[PDB]
């Protein structure tokens, strides 16, 4: 048929990285995929709104940073911003 | 208390079904003189004369749909609390004020 796009293997790899001896069920995997899709859609929509407000036709790292700060609360947002900045710096270096 | 509460909506008359409260058997369970006095406050159609010639009520004279509708409207007006004296006085004043202005249009209609 047609291939289905999902984050099952990525979520499983993250879980193994954080909890090597803890598994996951099919329903839990589907819930995690739905959560990831919903968060991705909300952040992308917020970034698109931010770009449209400033008459910007492109989405850069600043838009995603602002979307994360607006959406995620407090220390969770701060840690997410730190992780994203570290990932961007590592990508730029390599 | 001494007086029966008719003014405030807090009385259970609004929540009490007058259809069940008042019926033919309930009316027939009353003193004869009270029934005779009360019948004078009813229309002519529902009052007839029997063999003795005294005033009598028809079978549907009290348990028809129109009496139930009137009782329901009375309960609704109790809920609105229009029977209180504090508002009955202003209702009387509003009704009387109409005749003051009607004296100019009486001669034309």
């Amino acid at each position: 048929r047609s291939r289905k796009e999902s984050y099952s293997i990525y979520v499983y790899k993250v879980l193994k990285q954080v909890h090597p001896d803890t598994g996951i069920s099919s329903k839990a995997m589907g819930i995690m995929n739905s959560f990831v899709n919903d968060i991705f859609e909300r952040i992308a929509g917020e970034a698109s709104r931010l770009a449209h407000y400033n008459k910007r036709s492109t989405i850069t790292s600043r838009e995603i940073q602002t979307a994360v700060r607006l959406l995620l609360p407090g220390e969770l947002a701060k840690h997410a911003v730190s992780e994203g900045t570290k990932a961007v710096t590592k990508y730029t270096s390599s | 208390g001494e007086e029966i509460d008719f003014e405030t909506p807090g009385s259970i008359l609004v929540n009490t079904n007058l259809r069940a409260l008042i019926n033919s058997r309930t009316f027939h369970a009353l003193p004869s003189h009270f029934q005779q006095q009360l019948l004078f406050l009813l229309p002519e159609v529902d009052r007839q004369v029997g063999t003795d010639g005294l005033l009598r009520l028809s079978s549907s004279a009290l348990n028809n749909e129109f009496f139930t509708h009137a009782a329901q409207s009375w309960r609704e007006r109790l809920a609105d609390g229009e029977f209180t004296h504090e508002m009955q006085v202003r209702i009387r004043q509003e009704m009387e004020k109409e005749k003051k202005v009607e004296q100019w249009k009486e001669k034309f209609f």
Binding site: - | I4, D5, T16, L41, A70, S73, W74
Partner: protein, 301 residues
């Protein structure tokens, strides 16, 4: 200008037209719109729910419609009146039916009113119709007494009259400025089938679906009185019993029951046993967030 609200009942309208002085006419409540009635000589009165939401959302309506009357001669000849009185819609429809038909023994007041208003303009004609003491008294006699105490948004309903004035079905409305001509009949039917079809299409455009959508309509047919037809006797017995029961209903409807109920409750309370039965016959369930009490108390410190 009181003109209290009038109830739409067949016996009420029969007694009202009897009070108008006309002897050979009455109204009947048809039940099946797919059936056929015998001798539906006069027009039809249709009660429909009138809401201004559609007109507000369709404000471009003052233009002349295709079915609207163009000339003024026929409108001048026929009886059409606007809505200049707040609650004369029932009387407007009744007079539209009565004054737009022949072979009727109209009452002397109605006869002289028709003679005076023959060949007139609908606005001032309706204004003169409203300024009639006998008409107002007749309307108020059969009017319900309870609504007059209410003012001490709203679901309004209106009448429309269907009449074959010149062999064509014309619709008369109190609020519509110009009557609409939409009767092409005159081939084989007795004007009944076209009226039924137009009622069917009006209902179809009203709801057009299975949900109720505030289904409130009432169609009545104006018919010559059946008493003389039966005279010229089970039919006579049923006619006279219907007339008597309707007259009783009309007499009972116009009487307010506030004083009677108050006296009955006061007598029961002073007798002593009231607090018994009123304790047993309770509609709303107890202990449900409702403050039920204060029957025999004062609550005045």
């Amino acid at each position: 200008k009181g003109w209290l609200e009038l109830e739409s009942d067949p016996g009420l309208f029969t007694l009202l037209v009897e009070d108008f002085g006309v002897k050979g006419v009455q109204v009947e409540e048809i039940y099946d719109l797919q059936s056929k009635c015998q001798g539906p000589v006069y027009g039809f009165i249709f009660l429909f729910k009138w809401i201004e939401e559609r007109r507000s959302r369709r404000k471009v309506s003052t233009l002349v419609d295709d079915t609207s009357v163009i000339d003024d001669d026929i409108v001048n000849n026929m009886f059409f009146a606007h809505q200049l009185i707040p609650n004369s819609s029932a009387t407007h429809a009744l007079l539209s039916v009565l004054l737009n038909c022949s072979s009727v023994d109209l009452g002397p007041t109605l006869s002289r009113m028709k003679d005076f208003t023959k060949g007139f303009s609908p606005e001032s004609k309706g204004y003169a119709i409203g300024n009639a003491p006998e008409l107002a008294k007749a309307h108020n006699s059969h009017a319900r007494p309870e609504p007059r105490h209410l003012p001490e948004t709203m679901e309004a309903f209106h009448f429309v009259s269907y009449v074959p004035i010149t062999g064509r079905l014309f619709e008369l409305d109190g609020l519509k400025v110009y009557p609409i001509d939409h009767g092409p009949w005159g081939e084989d039917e007795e004007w009944t089938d076209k009226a039924r079809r137009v009622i069917m299409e009006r209902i179809g455009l009203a709801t057009a679906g299975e949900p109720y959508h505030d289904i409130r309509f009432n169609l009545m047919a104006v018919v010559p009185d059946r008493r003389i037809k039966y005279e010229a006797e089970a039919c006579l017995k049923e006619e006279v019993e219907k007339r008597k029961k309707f007259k009783i209903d009309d007499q009972r409807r116009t009487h307010n029951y506030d004083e009677f109920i108050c006296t009955f409750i006061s007598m029961l309370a002073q007798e002593g046993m009231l607090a018994n039965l009123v304790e047993q016959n309770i509609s709303v369930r107890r202990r449900q967030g409702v403050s039920i009490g204060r029957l025999h108390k004062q609550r005045k410190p």
